[PDB]
RNA sequence: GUGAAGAGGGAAACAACCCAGACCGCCAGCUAAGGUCCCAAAGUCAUGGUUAAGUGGGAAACGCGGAAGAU
RNA sequence: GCCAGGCUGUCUCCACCCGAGACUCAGUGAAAUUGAACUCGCUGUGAAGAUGCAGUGUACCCGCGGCAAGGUCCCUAUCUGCCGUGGGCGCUGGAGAACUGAGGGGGGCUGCUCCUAGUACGAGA
RNA sequence: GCUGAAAGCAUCUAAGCACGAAACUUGCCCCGAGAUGAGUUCUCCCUGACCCUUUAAGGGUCCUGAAGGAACGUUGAAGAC
């Protein structure tokens, strides 16, 4: 999961390496964020021509949670760390066409119909 | 005042009884009763109904005129009845009628159903035209106003329910 | 249809065939015997006073023994009221099963929460106070499973009280 | 003039507002200011008028309005 | 003297546990203050925020547990007010149970999508 | 808003005479008859004797000790006590 000033990993070829949370959206005066929640993150380290430069402010979504998330059948699928993929307010389609690691089955939302195609590993 | 000085002719088949301040009128449609204000005196006045303001009331003339108008309306109702016609202007505005409830659909996600007071008959010669027959003008007017309030005449196309 | 008094036993998750296991609290509802009927003529309002369970001979006071004898019911460990639905009254000595809740799908659970020790000023007023052991009614609870031949009720979520605590289940009047 | 150094009654309370200068006592009466629906003792008193708004029961200048006042 | 990095409940939010107090049992036991106290709220006046003066409302008597409104950041939280829980007492012979209820308390928030519907309306937008 | 003048028009009202805002209250649930206005219902127990006075919401003596509670032990998901 996410908290104030959380450290997030990167699961796309956008060039981001270290992304740090700044604000939490999806509810006024909200505390934390979930896997199926929109979070506000910025970048700390970028490749020579990374899509994100230091101090950037743009949305993102967590695909993997270190704390773990639940399922209706009691499954508590959890990962070694927090992985987040950047999103934009306009042109939601993320630049990265490749996602590292598996993804859960909760990405069946209206806007997440184009991400389930990616991530061949489940 | 001026309207009060006008006895109203009661046609045949209408029975009028003055029990003190109460006026009871009977006719073909059915019974009707109405408690009259004490500020005006009404006598039988066979074939008519004379109204006289009571001494000591400043509002006597207007009260007598209103009572005369109401008695005339009641007489005209009982003798023949009152009819009102309402049109529904607009596409998809239905006026289905069943039992003692009028169902209307004027663009709302739910039907609007209005109960019919006893003694009021609703008919639909055309699906978009609704006719109400009643012995009392007040009841028919109130039901018509309730139907009209569901969809106000739209002041860009003149849609809704209109008289 | 009408409120029944039962005893909390435990809570678990009932695994559904579609992997949607739901938290279910388990209530044992023995056949509650209607001890008395409170009517408008005598008691001033419509209701039934009911009991359930068994009482030890020493535990039954002679006034209570006479009350049960008049009621023609076995001495139950507790007595409770249940307001009728202005439909009809019950007869003295009538045992009510759990079939009434078999076709409700929405019930409210009233009970006393687990007691908690000394609640200091910070815990109470943020003088001191206490929390727990208070009769509160959690509403809008849908019954999951009903077993009349076993007197077993499974209700969604959680209910006040620990194992063996007495509680009441009533029709979900509030929605 | 009062308090200072004068009690007491009234103004709901109150020392400078009105009446009124206590020798002590007695279960009598008459007055001053103030009251006579009650609390709280007295007319729910007689006659001639204003009041329809609780203005009485807080308010100026100004054309009944002006008018907005303290847990 | 400065910078970059790793580094912990300082925090989001704190949750439980370990030893001494905080509470009771048997015994020791002093304090600052003290005119006497049958030591309520609100409105108004008062050498000017009244527990004590005029009006009004509430409250059975007495105990146990403290938040504290009354650069030693001093002055027993003694006493007023405050919630929970107790001892005595009356509901009219006594007692055990189930309750109606005069009244009091709590919260009554809010984003997105779907059918209506790209519909009424709208020259079109 | 149905008829509707006074004041041959008109008008929410003068007579007849109807809806309606999340604003207010019930309705949602908890405490609550110390509510001294001290409330309602069910059940159970006591069915003795004698003496005196200031002779009546009187007093005293012998016997009786009902239901219930508390007294103490095991103790609890009940509690600082």
What DSSP line would sit under A63-117, residue for residue? Answer: EE-SS----TTS-----SS-EEEE--SSS-S-S-----S---S---SSGGGTTTT
3-state secondary structure chain C: CCCEEEEEEEEEEECCCCCCCEEEEEEECCCEEEEEEECCCCCCCCEEEEEECCCCCCCCCHHHHHHHHHHCCCCCCEEEEEECCCCCCCCCCEEECCHHHHHCCCEEEEEECCCCCEECHHHHCCCCEECCCCEEEEEEECEEEEECCCCEEEEECCCCCCCCCEEEEEECCCC
C173 neighbors C107 (Cβ within 8 angstroms): no
Q: Maximum CA pair distance of chain A?
A: 45
The helix, strand and coil proportions of chain A, stated in percent and rounded to the nearest 5, come to: 0, 25, 70
C78 neighbors C138 (Cβ within 8 angstroms): no
* Residues of A whose CB is below 8 A from C19: 71-74
d(CA B149, CA B147): 6
C167 neighbors C27 (Cβ within 8 angstroms): yes
- Cβ within 8 Å, pair A72-C13: no
- Cβ within 8 Å, pair C21-A71: no
Q: What is the 8-class DSSP label of residue B69?
A: H
d(CA C79, CA A2): 51
CB contact set of A91 (below 8 Å; sequence gap of 6+): none
C25 neighbors C159 (Cβ within 8 angstroms): yes
The structure's method of determination equals: cryo-EM
- Reduce the DSSP state of residue B159 to 3 states and report it: coil
CB contact set of A83 (below 8 Å; sequence gap of 6+): A8, A9, A10, A11, A62, A63, A64, A100, A101
Place of tokens 């019919």: B116
Give yes or no for CB of B159 within 7 Å of strand E: yes
d(CA C170, CA C70): 27
CA A26 – C1' D66 distance (Å)? 56
d(CA C27, CA C48): 21
Q: Which phi-psi region, left, alpha or beta, contains residue C58 (left: φ > 0; alpha: ψ -120 to 50)? A: alpha
**Domain range for C157:** 1-175
* Residues of C whose CB is below 8 A from A73: 19-21
Q: What token pair was written down for A96?
A: 């990265």
Nearest C-alpha neighbor of B136 from the set B75, B94, B93, B85: B75
Query: Domains of chain A (ranges plus CATH)?
Result: 1-122 (2.40.150.20)
Give yes or no for CB of C162 within 7 Å of strand F: yes
Angle, CA C52 vertex, CA C175 and CA C5 arms, to 5°: 10
C76 neighbors C33 (Cβ within 8 angstroms): yes
Query: Domains of chain B (ranges plus CATH)?
Result: 8-80 (3.90.930.12), 86-162 (3.90.930.12)
Distances in whole angstroms, Cα of residue A56 to Cα of each of A41, A86, C2:
8, 11, 62
d(CA B51, CA B64): 6
Protein footprint on strand F: which nucleotides are under 7 Å from a CB?
A: 1-8, 14-19, 28-31, 40-45, 67-69, 77-80
Resolution in A: 5.1
CB contact set of B102 (below 8 Å; sequence gap of 6+): B95, B113, B114, B116, B122, B130, B143, B147
If one counts the domains in chain C, the total is 1
d(CA A43, CA A84): 12
Task: Find the residue in C nearest to A70 (Cα).
Answer: C20
CA distance A72 to chain C (A): 5
């Amino acid at each position: 999961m996410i908290q104030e000033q959380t450290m997030l990993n990167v699961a796309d070829n956008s060039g981001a390496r270290r992304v740090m949370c700044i604000k939490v959206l999806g509810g006024s005066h909200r505390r934390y964020a979930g896997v199926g929640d929109i979070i506000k993150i910025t970048i700390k380290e970028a490749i020579p021509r990374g899509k994100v430069k230091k101090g950037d402010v743009l949305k993102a979504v967590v695909v993997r949670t270190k704390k773990g998330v639940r399922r209706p059948d009691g499954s508590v699928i959890r990962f070694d760390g927090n992985a987040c993929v950047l999103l934009n307010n306009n042109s939601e389609q993320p630049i990265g066409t490749r996602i590292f690691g598996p993804v859960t089955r909760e990405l069946r939302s209206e806007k997440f119909m184009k991400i389930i195609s990616l991530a061949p590993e489940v | 005042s001026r309207v009060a000085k006008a006895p109203v002719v009661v046609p045949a088949g209408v029975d009028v009884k003055i029990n003190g301040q109460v006026i009871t009128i009977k006719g073909k449609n059915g019974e009707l009763t109405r408690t009259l204000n004490d500020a005006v005196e009404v006598k039988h006045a066979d074939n008519t109904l004379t109204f006289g303001p009571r001494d000591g009331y400043a509002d006597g003339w207007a009260q007598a005129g209103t009572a005369r108008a109401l008695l005339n309306s009641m007489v005209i109702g009982v003798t023949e009845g009152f009819t009102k016609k309402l049109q529904l202007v607009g596409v998809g505005y239905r006026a289905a009628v069943k039992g003692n409830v009028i169902n209307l659909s004027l663009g709302f996600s739910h039907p609007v159903d209005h109960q019919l007071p006893a003694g009021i008959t609703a008919e639909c010669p055309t699906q978009t035209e609704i006719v109400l027959k009643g012995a009392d003008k007040q009841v028919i007017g109130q039901v018509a106003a309730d139907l009209r309030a569901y969809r106000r005449p739209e002041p860009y196309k003149g849609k809704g329910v209109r008289y | 249809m009408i409120g029944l008094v039962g005893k909390k036993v435990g809570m678990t998750r009932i695994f559904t065939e579609d992997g949607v296991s739901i938290p279910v609290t388990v209530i044992e509802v023995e056949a509650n015997r209607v001890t008395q009927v409170k009517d408008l003529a005598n008691d001033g309002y419509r209701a039934i006073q009911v009991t359930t369970g068994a009482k030890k001979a020493n535990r039954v006071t002679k006034p209570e023994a006479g009350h049960f004898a008049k009621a023609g019911v076995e001495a139950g460990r507790g007595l409770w009221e249940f307001r009728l639905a202005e439909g009809e009254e019950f007869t003295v000595g009538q045992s009510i099963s759990v079939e009434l809740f078999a076709d409700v799908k929405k019930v409210d659970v009233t009970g006393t929460s687990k007691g908690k020790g000394f609640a200091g000023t910070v815990k109470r007023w943020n003088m001191a106070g206490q929390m727990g052991n208070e009769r509160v009614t959690v509403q809008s609870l849908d019954v999951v499973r009903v077993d009349a031949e076993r007197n077993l009720l499974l209700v969604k979520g959680a209910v006040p009280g620990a194992t063996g605590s007495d509680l009441i289940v009533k029709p979900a009047v509030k929605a």
